[PDB]
Amino acid sequence: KYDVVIVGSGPIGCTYARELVGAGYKVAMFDIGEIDSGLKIGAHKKNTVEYQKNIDKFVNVIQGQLMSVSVPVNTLVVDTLSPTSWQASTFFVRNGSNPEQDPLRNLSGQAVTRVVGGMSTAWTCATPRFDREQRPLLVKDDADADDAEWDRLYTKAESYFQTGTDQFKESIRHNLVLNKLTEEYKGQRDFQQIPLAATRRSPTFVEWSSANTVFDLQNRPNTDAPEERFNLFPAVACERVVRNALNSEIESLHIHDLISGDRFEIKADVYVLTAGAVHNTQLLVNSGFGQLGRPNPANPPELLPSLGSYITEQSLVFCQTVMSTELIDSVKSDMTIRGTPGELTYSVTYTPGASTNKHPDWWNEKVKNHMMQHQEDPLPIPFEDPEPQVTTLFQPSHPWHTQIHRDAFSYGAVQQSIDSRLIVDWRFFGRTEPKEENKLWFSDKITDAYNMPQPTFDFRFPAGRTSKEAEDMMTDMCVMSAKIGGFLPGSLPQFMEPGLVLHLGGTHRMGFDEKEDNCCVNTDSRVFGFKNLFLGGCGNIPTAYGANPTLTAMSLAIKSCEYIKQNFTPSPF
Amino acid sequence: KYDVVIVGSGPIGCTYARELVGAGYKVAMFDIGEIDSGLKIGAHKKNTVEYQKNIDKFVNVIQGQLMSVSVPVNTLVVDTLSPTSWQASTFFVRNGSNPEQDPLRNLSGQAVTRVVGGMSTAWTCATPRFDREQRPLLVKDDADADDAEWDRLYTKAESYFQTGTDQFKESIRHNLVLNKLTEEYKGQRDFQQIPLAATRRSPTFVEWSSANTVFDLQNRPNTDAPEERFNLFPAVACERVVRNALNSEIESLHIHDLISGDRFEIKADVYVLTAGAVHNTQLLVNSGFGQLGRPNPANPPELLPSLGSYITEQSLVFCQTVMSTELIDSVKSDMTIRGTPGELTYSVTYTPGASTNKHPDWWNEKVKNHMMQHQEDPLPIPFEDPEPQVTTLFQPSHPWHTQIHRDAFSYGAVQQSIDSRLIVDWRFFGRTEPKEENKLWFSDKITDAYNMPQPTFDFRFPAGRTSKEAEDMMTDMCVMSAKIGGFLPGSLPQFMEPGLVLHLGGTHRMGFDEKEDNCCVNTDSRVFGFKNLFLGGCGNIPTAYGANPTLTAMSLAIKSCEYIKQNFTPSPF
Amino acid sequence: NVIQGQLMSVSVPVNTLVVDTLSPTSWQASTFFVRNGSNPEQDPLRNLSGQA
Amino acid sequence: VDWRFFGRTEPKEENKLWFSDKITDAYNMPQPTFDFRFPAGRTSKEAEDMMTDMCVMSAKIGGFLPGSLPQFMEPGLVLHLGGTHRMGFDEKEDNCCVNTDSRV
Ligand SMILES: Cc1cc2nc3c(=O)[nH]c(=O)nc-3n(C[C@H](O)[C@H](O)[C@H](O)COP(=O)(O)OP(=O)(O)OC[C@H]3O[C@@H](n4cnc5c(N)ncnc54)[C@H](O)[C@@H]3O)c2cc1C
Ligand SMILES: Cc1cc2nc3c(=O)[nH]c(=O)nc-3n(C[C@H](O)[C@H](O)[C@H](O)COP(=O)(O)OP(=O)(O)OC[C@H]3O[C@@H](n4cnc5c(N)ncnc54)[C@H](O)[C@@H]3O)c2cc1C
Ligand SMILES: OC[C@H]1O[C@@H](O)[C@H](O)[C@@H](F)[C@@H]1O
Ligand SMILES: OC[C@H]1O[C@@H](O)[C@H](O)[C@@H](F)[C@@H]1O
Ligand SMILES: OC[C@H]1O[C@@H](O)[C@H](O)[C@@H](F)[C@@H]1O
């Protein structure tokens, strides 16, 4: 028996833990995955000296913990086997494939992570706010009050994640790109650093944020928190919440301890599901919410009929570019060069404080020293210069989020022939209208690796605005990127596989009224009809959004915890 | 000040820790890498429920922690850049490439791991003994005594690693392959399970061994070892051992703390280098042993002239096969089948104890139940059947090691069209003659990511026996694999990139006499001339070997620790 | 190239490759319909795909 | 050096070339359709013995060239299709279409 049980140790479960552990509740958290980040539990796996000296290797960490959600039956023909080798005469269900899944209506890129800290052990740490157009209402019919509430919640969420907008301010590459885009779109669009949940520790090391930054996940009481009560139980699959007959309260959480193999019940006053947008939905459907099995309008669900409908996933377009000659030359515009590199007389100088100069003295000092100390190198950019981290945020006239940066999630073999200092990534993210017909559903016959109902998608990007904007977004990336350089062969402009982006929303969506707003939870993230069941995560977000969703989910979680603190009393200690 | 300092927390450093911590020495261990395996420090990263349900993902873990040793300057032509993109007019040194390295005399596949537990956090756990022909002598001119000494040491090493030869005995696939090969080579060759450092915990989970199994790496004193003294210091680059002027003793270890950035000296009575075959050599050369820079016979080293010469790396050939129809049919040979799958009357039965039957009752029960419970599946092998783990060990008439198995280190995109139950890997490992001209050397101008002398290889597989055997080995794999099935398209018979195998030896090789045996350390792993400096690892092994080397290195380490225990006194506690 | 330019495949089964990186604006069918001269009679697993 | 080894295939009644009664080819003729598998038994055993023979023989000349590793080619690439209108002495006894003068 606990006051609060939290299912999942990602950043949203850790928001609940931070708030409720600190308010004096006796809290248990369960995660199906295991401790994986070193002694700081749930921390970012990129925070090792070795990864930040070898950042192109971190893609492997990401791939090693992303398990595909739904893989259709494979129908590739291999007809070069030896005649002696066994073969079936059909494309039978094999290798964990989902025979429920239509390959042409999938989110094939969707994947999940089962590790303590969830996906925050690997994420990019981009934490923009949503503007009004992307954001669910929290206050009706008072836009200024709605704005104020979101400001309060986002400010707190940014403190929990340690979001900032200046960690890359000393990068030549970053400023080169930022300034060029600002000049080219003079006035029409604004560019800034991507807001990043990160703290720079040195010129070559950034402590990226994670679940661990939100809550350190150490069992309590302990020496630094002697009056707090928290236990984390890894390798525990949560399987079901038990409803009372009234459908007004949850009475227990059924768990499966994966090490001992045993199944148990856990009692709490408050149950919080933060297993991610897929797995929250799976747990609820396994518990009698929504409808199990292939959708069937001749059998409508008794509870939460919009659960698993109106799902959204963003369109993602990507390319990389190779910096233009004009931009590279501009880095060294303040330099006077005499002689030829490698000779006795070679000299690269700048007149400091000359205001015929384009750059600050710090920039020019970096460049001069690189040029003098590495005369065999043909570029003016220092070797350890950090990557660009640039955005123009979503606006009505460009309704997509943008990142102009270097991401550790590379999508192809990493090329080695072109100097890495020249390369910039472009990722533009589109917003998807919620539609009832877009669904996440769970099989009544097929099970996943943990013996739970197999997830199945029925998804297409909506016709209309979603599709038109997606193609306008692609064009915008082609036009904007060209101001910085031409495309890099092997990273030409492309749409990524649906759901690779991992910004799935709306699977258990929020609204004011269950029926009118086709929703599952209220603005306190409380499941309609239930006193003591709350859902956290991106699954709550009911709108068409392009920006990265986690900060918005965390903000909703903070609001949810206010409701809990006001309506449930911590047990005596 | 410590009694013993150990550089590196791989399985060989942990052998030294196990032996010396337990004998009451005050021990410090430094590793340049960080804690990465969860709460069990230095443990195998495959020991998570999630990886063993998704084993094809573990390749990513391996790739994410293998950093190439020496990458030659890239000369690929990309001529499809936009005219606006910057480009150099030469193939200049970029992206961390090593301009010292001849691309045609490299071990391009060689890589290192910088993580607590070293490569044992990811390894395959194959731990065969070497036979006489592969093994260095420990006793001269008394082969039976030599045998006895190796038996004693290997027995102890096998206890430390928890090596066994029965963990796969209940696999249908394993036994199918094993038995077929035994029959086909009736008498001529013997097949057995690969010896594996592993303990099966359930039919679907194996606790693979690692450094952590050898020594748990927890600081001591602690509750379970209250009279022991050990500290592990991760994120500490060891840079130099300081020689006294006599070249008879090491007086300190120079370290660089990578978090604080500070450099310190550490004093011990005994210094143990277990940084791996590359990095032991780098540390020694950085300390004044051997010769820094491009080899030059007009400037012979004052100390350890054979350091970094006589290096060996194994040839590796690989393929995968798809099980033959005849073998698949044999799984179900004891079954009577009536009706057609999916109908009311379908029946798969066996007569238990009939000794017209080919298989034991347990096998037939597994098959019957799979066939009855999964009538839509066309194969008789159960879904969770473990992989084959088969070897015929090196012999004079087939002087290569073999593994007929499923390894988590896949080398290509994992194919999805052919059922995984059908697939078997084949890896044959050849022995390489030590030759003085095969060298690992370190640049006097180029530095690696940790500001240490850049490693450079000058390597070719020797002409003569090595090359002839390598090609005979390839042919042997082609002939043997054909008894099980035809090749799998996309995994056709091939030599792997030189050094991918990661069995590099001989970089600081062992022998009885420094000059006569062209060696660096004696049979106690003590560096000649030095009272208190010991080297552990594969770098010690001076012979041409085909089998996996770690168990042999650990056995040498056990012997080294006997010498230490007999010649150095632990400080009072 | 001469050889390839004059070898016309005898029987090509219906293609079932999934391309899911098209733009949302591009037309697509909801099935693997008979297209590009493929032979819907042909079992892809009992063919001489190289015959030409 | 290239290595190409060619195996013999037992004739079996079940291996067929047939023509569609609905689908037509580019010249508006009945579309050809194959129903073919290499026979179990001798054909398949020999094919795999042939592969092994190529691996053993080629090794006396040199190692494989990366990108041209030992492989079976797509069925029928070889273009040595036979027996579609086969010869024999007696139509029924020898399951055939033409006599030894190639007369139908
Ligand atoms: C490579 C990558 C880059 C990303 N970059 C960004 C970015 O820059 N900005 C951003 O906003 N978003 C980003 N995302 C998305 C972001 O990581 C997620 O939105 C966020 O982690 C969701 O938090 P969560 O706590 O709701 O769920 P998760 O982080 O998914 O955590 C859910 C947890 O629940 C557990 N669990 C699941 N099922 C069960 C069960 N049945 N029982 C018990 N436990 C269970 C899991 O093991 C997991 O740890 C990125 C994701 C990835 C992988
Ligand atoms: C994928 C894979 C599969 C393998 N499978 C097998 C197998 O089945 N059987 C087998 O016998 N072998 C196998 N090997 C090889 C085996 O893992 C190594 O032989 C073994 O780990 C070597 O042990 P070690 O302690 O000498 O060195 P390592 O395990 O390399 O450990 C050396 C340690 O030293 C540290 N270090 C390096 N430089 C410094 C420095 N300057 N200062 C401080 N610390 C430093 C490193 O961070 C590291 O942790 C495999 C390896 C890999 C990667
Ligand atoms: O695919 C990588 C992308 O993944 C998304 O989940 C992140 O939000 C982006 F920041 C990131 O660039
Ligand atoms: O490349 C993988 C191979 O790596 C080697 O280091 C191991 O010893 C083998 F067991 C393993 O199959
Ligand atoms: O695929 C090419 C082969 O084609 C066959 O038709 C020829 O008979 C062979 F000689 C030739 O090598």
Ligand positioned closest to the Cα atom of D82 = 5
CB-CB: which of C16, C22, C31 is closest to A75?
C16
How far does the centroid of ligand 4 lie from the alpha carbon of residue B108, in Å? Answer: 16
Q: Which of A364, A503, A508, A522 is catalytic?
A: A503
User: Quick check: D82 contacting C, CB < 8 Å?
Assistant: no
- How many CA within 13 A on the CB side of residue C43? 13
Is A116 in contact with A36 (CB distance < 8 Å)?
A: yes
CB-CB: which of A49, A60, A417 is closest to B60?
A60
Task: Give the DSSP H/E element, type plus range, for residue B494.
Answer: strand B494-495
Ligand positioned closest to the Cα atom of B128 = 2
Q: Measure the CA–CA gap between B565 and B421, rounded to whole angstroms.
A: 50
Residues in chain D: 104
How far does the centroid of ligand 3 lie from the alpha carbon of residue A500, in Å? Answer: 9
- 3-state SS string over A502-570? CCCECCCCECCCCCCCCCCECCCCEECCCCCEEECCHHHCCCCCCCCCHHHHHHHHHHHHHHHHHHCCC
The CB of A502 under 6 Å from ligand 3? The reply is: yes
Domain segments of chain B as ranges: 1-323+386-573, 324-385
Task: Give the DSSP H/E element, type plus range, for residue B401.
Answer: strand B400-405
DSSP code, position D56: H
3-state secondary structure of B290: coil
Which residues are paired to B350 by β-bridges?
B335
Of A231, A242, A279, give the one whose Cα is nearest residue A114: A279
Task: Give the DSSP H/E element, type plus range, for residue B476.
Answer: helix B465-481
What residues 461-480 of chain B have any CB closer than 8 A to a CB of chain D?
471-472, 474-475, 478-479
DSSP code, position B66: -
Q: Measure the CA–CA gap between B553 and B275, rounded to whole angstroms.
A: 13
Considering only alpha carbons, which residue of chain C is nearest residue A467? C24
CB contact under 8 A, B485 and A85: yes
3-state secondary structure of B121: helix
The CB of B429 under 6 Å from ligand 4? The reply is: no
Of B136, B117, B198, give the one whose Cα is nearest residue B164: B198
- 3-state SS string over A98-153? CCCCCCCCCCCCCEECCCCCHHHHCCCCECCCCCHHHCCCCCCCCHHHHHHHHHHH
Structure tokens at A383: 């070797």
CB contact under 8 A, A471 and C24: yes
Which residues are paired to B430 by β-bridges?
B400
Structure tokens at D13: 């009644």
User: Quick check: D47 contacting A, CB < 8 Å?
Assistant: yes
CB-CB: which of D43, D48, D74 is closest to A80?
D74
Structure tokens at B415: 């194919």
Q: Measure the CA–CA gap between B274 and A103, rounded to whole angstroms.
A: 51
The CB of D4 under 6 Å from ligand 5? The reply is: yes
Structure tokens at B171: 């696999």
Considering only alpha carbons, which residue of chain B is nearest residue A207? B259
Structure tokens at A414: 């990493």
Structure tokens at A118: 């969830």
Is B504 in contact with B113 (CB distance < 8 Å)?
A: no
Is A402 in contact with A195 (CB distance < 8 Å)?
A: no
Bridging pattern class, strands B268-273 and B533-535: parallel
- How many CA within 13 A on the CB side of residue B222? 9
Q: Measure the CA–CA gap between B261 and B266, rounded to whole angstroms.
A: 16
How far does the centroid of ligand 1 lie from the alpha carbon of residue A276, in Å? Answer: 6
Residues from chain B that touch D59, judged by Cβ atoms under 8 A, are 471-472, 474-475
3-state secondary structure of A260: coil
Q: Which of B503, B522, B532, B540 is catalytic?
A: B503
Q: Output the CA angle B454-B455-B456, nearest 5 degrees.
A: 115
The two most distant CA atoms of chain A are separated, in Å, by 89
Considering only alpha carbons, which residue of chain C is nearest residue A105? C30
Q: In the block, which residue shows the tokens 């950093």?
A: B67
Q: Measure the CA–CA gap between B388 and B426, rounded to whole angstroms.
A: 11
CB-CB: which of B471, B475, B492 is closest to D71?
B492
Q: Measure the CA–CA gap between A448 and D33, rounded to whole angstroms.
A: 39
Nearest atom, ligand 2, residue B62 CA: 1
Neighbours of B166 (CB within 10 A): 10
Torsion angles phi and psi, residue B316, rounded to 5: -130, 125
Nearest atom, ligand 4, residue B425 CA: 12
Q: Measure the CA–CA gap between A536 and B216, rounded to whole angstroms.
A: 38
Which residues are paired to B164 by β-bridges?
B196
How far does the centroid of ligand 1 lie from the alpha carbon of residue B76, in Å? Answer: 39
Which residues are paired to A268 by β-bridges?
A2
Nearest atom, ligand 4, residue B500 CA: 1
Q: Output the CA angle A58-A60-A64, nearest 5 degrees.
A: 130
Residues from chain D that touch B487, judged by Cβ atoms under 8 A, are 51, 70-71
Residues from chain D that touch B478, judged by Cβ atoms under 8 A, are 51-52, 55-56, 70
Q: Which of B175, B438, B532, B548 is catalytic?
A: B548
Structure tokens at A529: 């009809």
Q: Measure the CA–CA gap between A406 and A318, rounded to whole angstroms.
A: 12
Is B163 in contact with B195 (CB distance < 8 Å)?
A: yes
CB-CB: which of D44, D63, D70 is closest to B492?
D70
Q: In the block, which residue shows the tokens 């933060």?
A: A274
Q: Which amino acid is at B510?
A: M
For chain A, first and last CA: distance in Å? 13
Q: Is the dihedral of CA C44, C49, D3, D4 positive or negative?
A: positive
Ligand positioned closest to the Cα atom of A551 = 1
Neighbours of A166 (CB within 10 A): 10
CB-CB: which of D20, D75, D79 is closest to C47?
D75
Ligand 3 test: best mutation among A318, A409, A496, most atoms within 8 Å of CB?
A409
In angstroms, the separation between the Cα of residue A104 and the nearest Cα of chain C is 7
Nearest atom, ligand 3, residue A124 CA: 10
DSSP code, position B510: B
Q: Measure the CA–CA gap between B360 and B363, rounded to whole angstroms.
A: 6
Q: Is A349 exposed, middle or buried (0-12, 13-18, 19+ CB in 10 A)?
A: middle
User: Quick check: C19 contacting A, CB < 8 Å?
Assistant: no
Q: In the block, which residue shows the tokens 């709306």?
A: A506
Atom 48 in ligand 1: which residue has the minimum CA distance?
A118
Ligand 3 test: best mutation among A427, A429, A494, most atoms within 8 Å of CB?
A427
User: Quick check: D26 contacting C, CB < 8 Å?
Assistant: yes
Architecture of domain B324-385: 2-Layer Sandwich (3.30)
Task: Give the DSSP H/E element, type plus range, for residue B176.
Answer: helix B172-184
- How many CA within 13 A on the CB side of residue D36? 25
Ligand 4 test: best mutation among B548, B550, B554, most atoms within 8 Å of CB?
B548
Ligand positioned closest to the Cα atom of A50 = 2
For chain B, first and last CA: distance in Å? 13
Is B238 in contact with B30 (CB distance < 8 Å)?
A: yes
Q: Output the CA angle B263-B264-B267, nearest 5 degrees.
A: 155
Q: Is A142 exposed, middle or buried (0-12, 13-18, 19+ CB in 10 A)?
A: exposed
User: Quick check: C11 contacting D, CB < 8 Å?
Assistant: yes
Chains that touch C (3 or more CB pairs under 8 A): A, D
Q: Is A551 exposed, middle or buried (0-12, 13-18, 19+ CB in 10 A)?
A: buried
Q: Which residues contact A100 (CB under 8 A, 6 or more apart)?
A: A70, A294, A443, A446, A454, A456
What is the per-residue DSSP string for B205-239? EEEE--HHHH-----EEETTEEEEEEEEE-SEEEE
Atom 1 in ligand 4: which residue has the minimum CA distance?
B501
Active site residue B548: yes
Nearest atom, ligand 2, residue B237 CA: 42
Q: Measure the CA–CA gap between B552 and B541, rounded to whole angstroms.
A: 8
Structure tokens at B145: 């005594």
Ligand 2 test: best mutation among B66, B123, B238, B540, most atoms within 8 Å of CB?
B123
Q: Measure the CA–CA gap between B241 and B250, rounded to whole angstroms.
A: 6
How far does the centroid of ligand 3 lie from the alpha carbon of residue A194, in Å? Answer: 12
The CB of A409 under 6 Å from ligand 3? The reply is: yes
Q: Measure the CA–CA gap between A468 and B123, rounded to whole angstroms.
A: 50
Is A401 in contact with A128 (CB distance < 8 Å)?
A: yes
Ligand positioned closest to the Cα atom of A499 = 3
Q: Which residues contact A69 (CB under 8 A, 6 or more apart)?
A: A107, A110, A111, A112, A278, A455, A457, A499
Technique behind this structure?
Answer: X-ray
Structure tokens at C2: 């001469």
